[PDB]
Amino acid sequence: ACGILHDNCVYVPAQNPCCRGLQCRYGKCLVQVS
């Protein structure tokens, strides 16, 4: 259960719980796409 593009999360990259490619923003894990 890696943090997804709309999975509530905090900006702690050091221990990124998200799927590699997504980055936690204070609130939700942002899909680091542009």
| C-alpha pair distances (Å), 19 with each of 3, 10 | 6, 14
| Cβ neighbours for 22, distance < 8 A, ≥ 6 positions apart | 2, 3, 4, 5, 29, 30, 31, 32
| Cβ neighbours for 4, distance < 8 A, ≥ 6 positions apart | 18, 19, 22, 29, 31
Taking the C-alpha atoms of residue 13 and residue 3, their distance in angstroms, rounded to an integer, is 11
With b meaning 16 or more CB within 10 Å and e meaning fewer, what string describes 12-24? eeeebbbeeebeb
| C-alpha pair distances (Å), 17 with each of 7, 27 | 10, 13
Q: How many residues does the chain have?
A: 34
13 phi and psi angles, rounded to 5 deg: -65, -30
